[PDB]
Every structure is written in C-alpha cells, then in structure tokens.
Design a binder for this molecule. Structure first.
Ligand SMILES: [Cl-]
Ligand SMILES: [Cl-]
Ligand SMILES: [Cl-]
Ligand SMILES: [Cl-]
Ligand SMILES: [Cl-]
Ligand SMILES: [Cl-]
Ligand SMILES: [Cl-]
Ligand SMILES: [Cl-]
Lengths: 326, 326, 327, 326, 326, 327
C-alpha cells in the first residue's frame, strides 16, 4: 500500500493518487472509531521525539491528541552543542520516530539517512501534506460527491503555500480547481505547468483567473487565507491590501457561485474581526473592521466549515502515524 | 449531585451546600481508593488542554497527578494572531476539556459558550473553589466532627482571596467562622452582607473582630496566609507589617484557643523562616527572624497540618475532573 | 540487592561491587525485554517530579523513555524564590512517588531526601551520575564478551574531569585493568588516586596512570575520551587545555598502538569530531584541528566506534535505577 | 503516611496519633471490602515466615485468615542449632517478612537490623498494638461517636498488659479512659505519669479509681479481663479473687453506668462459666459458678460485643500486613 | 438437592435417597472435571478451620487436596482455657466452615447452633457419610449397573462402623446387601430393624448370615475390614481371630460367588502382609503369613479395587464442601 | 533435557554433565524471573505430599517457597505403624502429583517410586540432595563470572562427610579444579576417589587431595568448609575430630594463602562460628575456640563470605527440580 521508503518525509508533489486515497480512507476509518468509542491503539509503547526551533499551536495540538489516542508518548526537545547528525543517531536508538519542525526538506532528508527511524518534516507544522489530506477529506464529507467531481476555488494570495498546495492536490486527484488572484500573485509558472501536466493524466480541470465572479461559479467550496503570511514584513500589508481587496470573501462572492450549498474554508488563523491584536491594528489603519480576507458574517455563517476543517487535521496526522509506525 | 450547566466554571458563592457535600464525598472516596491501591481510571483517553498566562508549581502539580491517576493526558499551550474564541472552538473539537489559568471569570464564561466542552477558570490556580474544598476536607478529617459544628479562625490579611473564600464556604456549610484582622483589611461590606444572608439559612456563625484572643477562643483550626499577596507591590510590606504584627500566629495564639487539639493551617507558600529569599529580605529589614505571618516553631509543630492540607488539593481537583468529564 | 536507605542518592564510590553487579544484571534483563517486546511495566501509575536548574537532551530523553516504558509519568517543575526547597519537597512527596533534582549538589539533595518522604535522586537525568558508569561498563561487557574483571580500558584526555574520576573509581571497584593517560597536571587528585589504589588492592584491579599514550593503550579492549573543556569551565581554559592535550588526541594511530585489532572507541558525547557545531568549528579553525579535536572524525565514524550503543545503554541503566528504587 | 523504618516492630507507646488513625481507616476499608465481596489481594505471591516457641490460637488464626485473604502464604518454623542472627539472614532472602512470637522486644529489634525484611514482634500474639486498634475500632463502630468523645472503663487486674495498653491508647487518642481496680493493682506509676503527659496534649480524660460506681458512670463501654494472666502461679488466684471480687462485671455494674446503650468488652478467653476445665476448678474451690470476672448473664447478653471485638483483630492485623508489605 | 438446615453435620441414616443421589452425581461431575483438566474453583477465598483431638493420614490428605482443588485454604487448630462454644463463635466470624474430628455427634450438634457457619462432624475422619458415598461411587463405576441392582457382601466384624454403615446405605439405596459374620458380631438389633424398615420402602434385599458361601453367592463386590478396630484393646485379637478365621477373604471366597467380574474392596488400612509392624506381630503370633482379614494374593490381584476406592474419598469430600459452602 | 525415568530420585553420581547444565540454566532463568517480578507459575493446582522422619528449617523453607512461587500446595504427613509404606504411597499417588520422602534412604524410595505412580523424591527437602550441589555450583558461577570448568575451589575440613563426597563428585563431573584438604584418615573412601579420577579423565577436571591447607588453597576462587561433626554421629566423635581438624580451620590467614584477593568463603550451614548456639558455646569453651570452630567469626561475617547467597540459591535449584519433573 503506502510502501515507499521515504514515506515519512515525502513532499506533496511526490504522493501518488493511490497513496493519497489510501491515507484518506485510513483517516475516515480512524475518525469513525474515535467518534464511536471503539478506537484501537496500535502505537502503545511508542515514543516520538519532537525537535523544533519555532513553534506552532493549532497543528502541534492536533499532533499531541493523535499520538495519545493511539497510545504513543511525545517528548519535547528544545532548541547548538551536538551536530544534528549525532543527535539523530542517539535519538534513533531510544525513540521510534523523530519529528522536525522548522528545518526544511533538505536537512530532514539528510538526517533520515542516519536516524534509523521514520523522520517527519513538519508533521506538526502548518505546511505539510496532511493539511491537504484534511482539506480534501472535509470537501468529500460535506459535498457527498466523488472527489474528482468536486469543484473548489482558492482566492487571495495564491502564491503562498496554501495556494501552491491546493493547486497540486486538486491536479493529483482530478478535481475542478480554480485559483483566483492578481496575476502578480499567481503560483510560479514552473509549478503551474507541472500541475497542468498532472491534470492531463488525471482529468483535472485547472483554472487560473483574476475574475472572482468566473472563478466561483459552480464551486462547492471557497477557500481563502491571510494575505500576508507569518514572517513577511508588516510593510507588505499596505501593498497587499491594495492588490487583494477585490479578492475578499464576502457574502456577495458566495452568492456569485450560484450554489445554495456552497461552503467556506480557511486553514486558520483568520483575520475575520478585530478581536486579535494584529487584526485590530489592520482594522484601524486600513479601515477593515469587519474582517480582512473574509467578513465576520461569512466566517460565522452556517456556510462556514473552518472548524470541521481544522478538526480533520487530527485524523490525517493520526493516519500518517499509523501508516509509518506500524 | 453536580448537574448544572455551568458546573465546570462555577464560582464559589454559586455552589449550593448539596453540591459541595457531593464533591467532598467524591474526594473522600477517590482518596480512599488511591491510598488502598484500588483506584479505577474513569478518564482513560481524555485529553485536557491547558491555556495559561501565569504559572504555579504546587497546584499545577496537583492537577497533573490527578489527571494521570484517572488516565487523562494534559497538553500545555502557550491572542496575538488567533482570537481566543477561534482557539477555543478549534480545541473544543480535539480536546475534552480546556483549563484557563489567569484570565478572569468574564472571559472564561464567554469562551464556555463556544468551546463545546467543559471549561475551567483556574482549576490549576491557587484561587479556585477546589482549594476551599480541600481545606474543608482537611478540617473534617482532623476534627472528626460534623462540618457545621466545626469552628475555625482566619487571621491576617482578611480581604485577600483566602479570607474572602473562607468566609464564603463557612457560611455555605453552616460552620463557625471567625475572621480576625484590622478593620481596614476586612472583606468588603457587600461580600460580608452576602455571607450574612447565607449564614441565616445555614445556621453558620460569622464573626469579624480585631482582637485575636477573642477570635481563636474555642476554634479547632487557626488559618493564616502571607500578608502581601503575589502581585501586589513590594512596598505594601512596610505598611502591612506594621498593621499585622499583632496578628502573627505563634504558640501563644494557639494556647489562647483553650483547645489542646487545635491545628494550624496555611494554603502556602509561607514565610515561616529565612530559607526563601523574599522571606529573608523581610526578616532582615523588619527584624522577623522567627518567621513573618507564622513562627517556624508553629509551622513545624505537630499541630501543623499544612502538608496534609496541600495534599488534599490533589483529591479535590480530581473530584471536579471526574464530576465534570463523566 | 540494592537495599540501602540512601540507595536513590548514593554516590559512585559508595556503591559496593555486589550492588553494581545487581544493577548491571537488571539493566541486561530490562534491555532484553524491550528488544524482544516482552517488557513488563512495573511502575504503572507512578508519578516522578523533575526539578532542574540546568537542562540536557541525551540524558533527559533517556529518562523520559525509561519512565514511559515502565508506565510512569514525569512532571517538570522549573524556576526557590518564594517557597523553601524543604517545603516544596514535602508538598511534592505527598503527591509524587519520586523527586529527581538536577543541578543542585549532593549535600542539598541529601538533606531534602530526609524530609521529602519519597526516593530522591541527585542528577539521575544528569551526565554525571553513577548510571553513566553502569552504562559504560555494560557496553564494555557486551562488546568484549569477557568477564568484567579481565576487561582492560584506557581513558585518555582530561583525566581530572568527572569522566576520568568516575572511570578510575568504577574500574577499581570491579577489579578491571584501568589506565588513565593524561598530562600529570590533569591527573585525578592524589587523594582520590590513593583511595582507588586501596580499592584496587581488595578487588585485584590493575590501576595505571601515565603520560604516555603508547603505553596506556597497549593491550586495551577500549579507548575512552571526552571533551577537553567543559562549557561550564571558563572559556579562557580552552586555550591552555588544548596546548596541553594535543598529544592525547585519539586517532587511528593510537588505536593501532593498542595492538588489538578488536579495540573499540568510546566517548560519552557530545564530541568535537568535526565542524558541524558552532563551537567545534571555532576550536577547529583557531587551533588548526580540521579533522577533529579530541578524536578524529575518521575514528568516530569507523566501525570501531561504539559511542551510539554506549549512549543507548544509559536508557537501560536509568531504567534499572527506577525499578530498583520504586518497587 | 505510616512511613517509619521500625513500623513493623513498633511498640504501642511509639505510635503517633496520625499513624493510629491511618491504620484504623485502613482497617475500616479492608473490612468493608471483605464484607462486600470486593477484596483486592495486594500480597499475592508473598511468603511470611512464622517463628515461635509458645503458641496461640485465637490470634494466630486471625493472622492466617488475614494473610490468605490478601494472597500471602504462611510457613511455620518450629522451635537450637543455628544462631537467630544467622537464621534471620537466611530467611530474609527467601521470605518477605518474619513474625516472631514469644521472644520479646529486645531480641526482635536486634534481628530486624539483619533480616533485611519487615520483622514483627508478636503480630500473632495476644499482646500487640493491633489488639488495641481492634478494640478502638469496635468502640467507634458501636458508639457512632468521634473517638475522642468515647468513654470506657477497664475494671479488674489493671496492671496486666490489657490495663496498661488501654490506658496508653486512650491517652494517645484523647478519649475518656477510666481504670478501676485495687490500688495495689494499678499500672506502674511511671507509666501513669507518662500517659498523664500524653493526655495533656490530646485532651484525654484519664481517671484511676477504686470505686466501680464512679468509674462506670457515663461510660459507653465496660472492659474486663481474667484476674490471673497465663503463666502466673495458680496460688495467686486465691489472693487475687479476694482483691478483685468487688470488681466483677455483673448486671448491676452495667446499670450503674446510667447508659442504656452500654456495651461489654473482653479480650478473651474469659471465665464466664464452668464449661472450661480451669474455670470449673475455680468455680468449685472459690464458689464462683456463674463466672469469675464477668457473669454468664452479662457475657451472653445483647450488651456483649466480645465476638465482634475478636473479629476486628483480623482486620487490624490485615491492615498491618498491607501497610508494611506494600 | 442438598438444602436442609443440618446438611453439614447430617448423619448417614438421616440422608434421604434423593440427597445421596445428588451428592453422587456431584462427585461424578467433579471427578470428571479434575480428570479432564476443566475443574472450576467454586471455593476461592474460603477458609476452613480444622479442630481435632485425633489425626489420620488417608482421609486428612483427601480433605486437603479436595479443598485446594476448589481454591479453599485449611487452617489446623490445636477446651482447657476457652469454652468450645466460645471458640466456635470466634472462629465463626473469621472462617467459612469448621471441621471437628473426634468429638462425637452431640457436641458438634450443639456447637452448630452457635458457630454461625457450616460445621462438620469428622469430614476428615474415616467414619463419615462421605466414606459410604465413595464406596457406592466405586461400586457404580465398576459394575456399570443401576445402583439398586448392585449386590455386595461385607464379611468380617460386622458390628464395627464399616458394617453398620454398609447396611444403612445399601438399604437407603435399594441395593442387595449381605452382612456375613458370627452372630455375636452382628449389628445391634435396633439398627437392623431400622434398616429393615428402610429396605421395605426402597426394595433393598438385606441378609444377615453366618455362612460365607451363602453370603457371596452372586455378589459384584466382596468387602472386608480389620477384625479389631483402632482404639479397641489389643487383647481382642486373640478372641476375634478365633471367631473370624472362617471369614477370611481369599481366592476361594471370591470364586464361591460364581461371578468372574467380582471385585474386592477394603476401606484401609489393611493387614494383608507383614510389612506393617502390627500386622507382622499378628502374623507371627497366630500363624497368618498370608495376611489376616484378606490374603496378599487377593489384595494385589486385578480384582482388587481398594485404591480406586481410596481415591474416590477425595471426590466425595469435595462434593460435600461444594454442596455446603456454595 | 532431564528426561530419564528415575529423574526425580536420581543420585548425584548418576547425573550427566548435560543434565546438570540444563538444571543450572533452569535455576538461573527462574531466579531471574523472581527478581524481575515476571515469574510464571507452571505448577498451579499441583499438590505435593511430604512424608518425613526428620525435620529441618533452611531446606524445608526453601522447598515451601519454591512450591508456592510456582502455584503448588504442600501437605505434611507425619508419624509406618498400621499401613505399609507401599500401600500409603499408592493411596497418595492417586490424589497427589508428587511425593517427597525425607529420611528414608535411597533403596526404600526407589522401590516406592515403582508403585506410587507419580514422581518421588529422595530428600529434596534434605541437606544432602543433588540440588545442594547445584546451588553451590550456581553460586560459584555467579561470583567468579568465569566458565565452570575453569573454576577452582578447595573444600577443607572433614572431607569424608556428605559435603566432601558430593563436592568431589560434582567438580569431577563438570571439569572443575577440585581440591579436598583434610587429614588422610578423613579423605573420601578410596573407591569413590578412583571413581572421580575416572570421571575427571573424561572431563578434564583437576582433582587434588592433600593434607596441606597452604597448598590446597593456592589459586582457588572459593574455600568451602562444613561442621566437623554431625549431630547424628555419636557425641564421642566430637572430641577426637576436633583434635584432628584444628589445623584445618578456615581463618583470615588461609584466605590470604590463596594469593587471590577475590577469594570467597562458602559454608552449607549451620556454622559454629561463635557462641550464640548452646552447642557452639560448649565446643568453644571446652576446646578453647572463642573465635569460631571451623571458621572464624571474622571470616564468616567478612565481605568475602557468600554463605547467605549460597543458602538462597537452594530455593532456586529445588524450584528447578520441581518444574523439570512435574511439567
Ligand atoms: Cl498511481
Ligand atoms: Cl443545597
Ligand atoms: Cl560487595
Ligand atoms: Cl590526525
Ligand atoms: Cl501526631
Ligand atoms: Cl428421597
Ligand atoms: Cl553429557
Ligand atoms: Cl584464628
């Protein structure tokens, strides 16, 4: 099944459609067991080491609950007196797996040669293949349609990791993907052509446009994300709000889909109000009190499934832990 | 039984006498099982998220052991970028409970409306209804008398949270409470009159006096706390010392009760010697080598039960976790 | 059997040979069970409080896995500002089954051990602790496959640090053939040498102290070294120590000088064997040591290196202490 | 809790009031489990060696049932070719505890230094702290009152081990103790003053009188024992009956208490009839057919609780075995 | 079923035929489980006190194995100082049953009124209803015929307890009983007439004769016992030998039955050779080298079932313990 | 494997080296399980009858704990007056799973073994039984930490009692270096010496018999002694035996004469090493031996004494026999 040697530190473009479907089915079964009270711990006695230099909460917390539900412990190693090559080989003889948050694909790949145990690259991080597994699992649950018939549109800053990953996964699974943003914020052309080649073999419909009205007509799901990602200078906001104001998700855009059942999605955190210190500061400076990338009315509406989407990250992380540690 | 909608974040004055007795009986049974080796984990598989802006050792440690004894796990989480209302709802779909240390009743009440799971306001914090449950359990164990016949005196700074809470619980349970302090350090009149109304329904005797010889006459327990509470300016020490020297707990005060079985209590930490660096600073400056609010002689005497009192906080936290998560 | 009252905070030189052998057998059995999948949790439901003033990774991680494998939980307490350590120990002793104190010193821990009411450890999670010596001896026994009192090893380098002192002590107690090789000014203190000579006379141990690497390693089964300077020792000390200890580097020629094709290399780690550390690169560039400082990268990565099996065995010896003292 | 190193061979005067209360609570919980059918064996696989030179039945049988109920085996070693120091060290490597019956406190204390396992001094013997735990447990059960409010009178030969032990335990626990006997048969004055010092700190009321009518007024329990203890010459009976006839327990004495609920107690065996070979011989010689230290009418009355008292020795012995072997 | 108040100390003649059949079926089932490895302990945790004035090996050993097989423990206890009525009531509150070996029916009946737990009269003793249950079970196993069609002859001293009991049980179960002995050694007339009345209700054939050739004609089993029973004066041997030589069991007597399948029985011990020091004394003095009451040739022959007969005493004791303690 | 029909009543000299090694491995594994808490009862539900004419404490207690640890029960039968032992054995063999005969002799037990129908032991609870030799060899292996056939030991004292005979036999069977040191009139019978020399030739054992203590102990790992007289031997024999055996006392000088700082002392117990026995005090006062008779109190209580570990191992070897013969 999911039998590749580098399966634990695979990047998203490397997943075959068969492997993705296998992990999605695994996530469905694990989620059913937890809801039904009949979960079977197959990681009893396992120990997982977690090494980081910068931290996360929403996705590091999903990881903890996934591990404990399956009977594993997590040990936190905090952030330079020993080479990472040496430390990985010491930890690989006491622990059953090592998670690296904040190091990048290249370092993790080298350490995988020497650890002797499965090594993950950011399983607890916001950018990881399991987030896309979680989003597609959410889309299948709410649409009740075959995955290759599902249509969705990502709108906003489409060249960040959320835009690139949504384009990739939709192409891999033969879905109807639309990315809507200013041309200067589209994914890199090299990546676009890579996903066009993928789409030809899977039947995927891939559209990139600057027109929100065209991008959302017929979609089951509308997906957005903060216009400035964590780390970029604040000074970038003023420019980005100028580019991306026409690309806000508001009630009118959902109606432009023509679909009464359309749902809204967001990988979170989201500036949908001024109850955040950063969000309020933007609300005062640029006159956006009702939300930046999505209005509070849409965020709190029954069309919003952001918190079901967040929950499904628990089950897909759990699926990776089961797939790679048993 | 404990079957109210707001049971997890109930404030002390909102508890009914029946609810308190139920949780005291629950704590006594759970303590019996732990001592006898027959404890049954009722919270296997549960995960509790712990969100905090401050930290403590004695009560955070009691919480951890209570959780593990019942089979639960604890995850520590450290607004800024995500609204607390957003964070609560994300955690509410992965975790079975959320503990908020150091946020205040109003915030926690609002977050309880949205989390979808039990929410506690400082269950791991020094100031919480479980501390009064532990103190009353300690009093009942050592006196061996019906709770409403027990007499005790709190002496010192009586308008801090220890003094307010001891007055409230004693009135709730029909006990004989004496608060002894200078008038300027008495509880607020609104709270006293609230407790007088409670005392009329329950038969409690509530006394507020400035004369220590009068306050301890006939008590089974004498209870004190640090004169300047953590958080208040250091400079309060100079004035409050002058006020509170006549209210020090020493051997003479215990004898003034006339009860050979009188016991001393203290919620801790206590400046009873110079082996704490704040306490030695107070000892050098104000000439208090024997201790500040209680003498080392009393603190170490066989009449001192401060450490049985500390232990019982574990069992009362456990009772709340069991009562609210099963 | 390990049934003394101060067994949890016992010092290395206070251990008897019978107690050391008992804990080594316990470590072997626990390691066998973990490998075979038949480990039996004897500490289910236990809670261990860990109070620390400094932190580590290799040994704190060994401790966590040891405790979890046996079913116990660990709670961390971090900075004695407002509560005296005596008060805190007595609060914790009524909720927890053991308290581990890292970074406080033997005398403080002994006094707290009186009042806590539960087993108390002095640096069970610290690099300097008797279980490190138990781990090293266990590693030597596994690889040499000969009785412990016939095993020969040489520690070479800064022989008056904790590694050198403890290796001389443990070798004398177990009747082994110990050599310490270092400049005369870096030998263990003369009173400790005389103590270990007295121990060696009763056990049959052969104890040698020499300034000559070629003689120190002749016939040894193991060559053992450590970093020449502690991060805790002042940074000035790094310059003079390196000048003294350059002739005591471990390299392929020193292993050849043993005359033993089966000789193994040991190091309690971390090791400055390349420039993938910021400090290791700075030592290498300033003092012209690109191939490694106290051991060459060639020896450290060779098949004769057993440093990572040596590191693993600390997990099993810590686990032995937890079982011996909490059951 | 019960954490002293010499806890297994402690003599009665060494017990702290906290330790006594802990063992009484342990006895209550163990007795409840046995009655309820929910007893948990925590001594499974333990082996206990029993070394004696003179034997007992009522208390050696309580010991056997206590050990088997908790999963332990008992091996009998019978009564000089090996030094007791050598034998103790051989047995301490095969067995988990050693019980010594008939050797005395001094020998047992020395052997405890070398056995390497808990050593008991007469846990199966009539004179042992657990008999006093059993008697106080009986008193609390039938009175349904706090132990320090309980009143009882021992009458008869008050300088034997029963009189000395009842005086000690009552002083330790703050009870109302009366000993009634001829002055020449009072406890040794040195012991009386020791228990007067104890009573001052615990609130105990300690009375020694020659007047039965004064000693029993207001008592919940009346306690007596055979006038001549096992071993003393028969010739001593003739003198003792002369001294102690006014101190017999008969129906009139129970009425002199003024308490309709008063109960009668006796550590047994008792000469309450002539169905014993020794008892009949006294009945013929000294004209006491209806009982010697207590009338048969009182012994068989509903006021008698001698057999509940005997049963409780099982549970207190069980409490010591649990407290010292786990 | 076995549901009478006096079931534990019932005498043989007090058993009803239904009760006997129930205990025989219980013994057959328990024996089947022990042989098949499927025995279920029904007496886990039970404690049986054993009070005795005499001792035996064969039947005390059968009792011990029956008790352990079912999970029970046995404690041996060795008046003088305590009345038996007092001792019984003390033991009745710690033990689940009491066995009295060697005291007589009347004493045990009185003690049953007070012990509060089942009391047996010599369940571990050679003379007990379970011995007849074992003998009848042996007869049924080997004959493979309905019990009331079985024929057997007891020969020898027929007014000892073996002869009395075989006459009683055979009448109770409708069997064909022949007692063969000199008239002066016949059972008492009162007992014979008691058994004749029983035989009329059950269809039993009861014969009493002096001619061995007549007594064994057509029997399936020939049964004998020692001519002088343990306890009787040695001097009875001289007279009783003279009386009982014509009644020796030898090969000729077995052939006189005319049944090739005839089996020999003996409750044991038996003087069948000179390897018992009493038996050799009788052999030397009276010229009986071949054996006394049975020849060594018959005892060791394949027609001898004395050892299957001995084993079945284990299973019948077990049936009584199960029937009376569950 | 221990699969002979007379395995339960096998005599020491009838054991093969393979069977001895098998039972020693079984003893090691059972001891490891008991220490680690992972002992598996293989004799649950068994009943063992114990018929005895004499009684003991050390070995009867080892037997009870061995049987209980494995789940079996023991029933005691005490005085062949009215029932022949053949009859009794056949009654018991149909209710019990094994019968242990103490104090009856090999020939009687062998004949009863034919008829009982269950395993029968000859003195499994007795001081003289092969499991005592298994226990002693196990003790020597644990403390020397070297292969059994390289182990050297000297038995010194009355070498023609059961201890001396059995130690010579077991050493020859296992290829060890045995020395017996005693007066010539107290050596084992010459026919047994020749038997053990024949055994020693096939196994490589080194067997020495000498009257010189200083030569007997040179190079030994263990010095082993026993009481000079049996309580069963007539009391007259005590006077002459002491005169003969005074030069063969074990004291600190004899251990020094071995030249081995690691030498250990062994004694099957009880030992007259002080006057805390009535008989030991009487020997000491009459013959002027206040410091001990066959061993000084100084040696008996020293760290070189292993008599109490030696005593414990009898529990594990008896347990090995019960498992090997009843499963
Ligand atoms: Cl594919
Ligand atoms: Cl209420
Ligand atoms: Cl040692
Ligand atoms: Cl080099
Ligand atoms: Cl106290
Ligand atoms: Cl009927
Ligand atoms: Cl062989
Ligand atoms: Cl000497």
């Amino acid at each position: 099944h999911f039998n590749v040697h580098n399966r634990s530190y695979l990047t998203l473009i490397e997943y075959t459609p068969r492997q993705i479907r296998y992990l999605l089915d695994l996530s469905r079964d694990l989620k059913r067991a937890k809801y039904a009270g009949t979960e079977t711990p197959r990681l009893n006695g396992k120990n997982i080491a977690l090494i980081f230099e910068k931290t996360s909460t929403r996705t590091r917390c999903a990881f903890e609950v996934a591990a404990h539900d399956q009977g594993a412990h997590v040990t936190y190693i905090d952030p330079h007196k020993e080479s990472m090559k040496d430390t990985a080989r010491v930890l690989g003889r006491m622990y059953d797996a090592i998670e690296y948050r904040g190091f990048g694909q290249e370092i993790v790949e080298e350490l995988a040669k020497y650890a002797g145990v499965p090594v993950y690259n950011g399983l607890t991080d916001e950018f990881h293949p399991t987030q896309m597994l979680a989003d597609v699992l959410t889309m299948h649950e709410f649409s009740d349609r075959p995955i290759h018939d599902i249509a969705y549109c990502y709108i906003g800053d489409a060249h960040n990791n959320t835009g690139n990953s949504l384009m990739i996964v939709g192409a891999k699974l033969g879905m109807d993907v639309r990315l809507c943003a200013p041309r200067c914020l589209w994914p890199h052309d090299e990546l676009i052509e890579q996903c066009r080649a993928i789409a030809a073999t899977t039947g995927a419909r891939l559209t990139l446009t600057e027109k929100p009205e065209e991008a959302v007509k017929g979609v089951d799901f509308i997906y957005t994300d903060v216009w400035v990602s964590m780390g970029e200078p604040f000074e970038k906001w003023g420019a980005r709000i100028e580019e991306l104001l026409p690309y806000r998700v508001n009630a009118a855009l959902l109606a432009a889909s023509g679909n009464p059942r359309v749902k809204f999605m967001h990988c979170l955190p989201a500036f949908h109000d001024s109850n955040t210190h950063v969000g309020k500061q933007i609300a005062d400076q640029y006159g956006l009190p009702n939300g930046v990338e999505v209005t509070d009315d849409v965020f709190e509406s029954d069309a919003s499934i952001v918190f079901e989407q967040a929950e499904n990250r628990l089950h897909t992380i759990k699926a990776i832990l089961v797939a790679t540690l048993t």
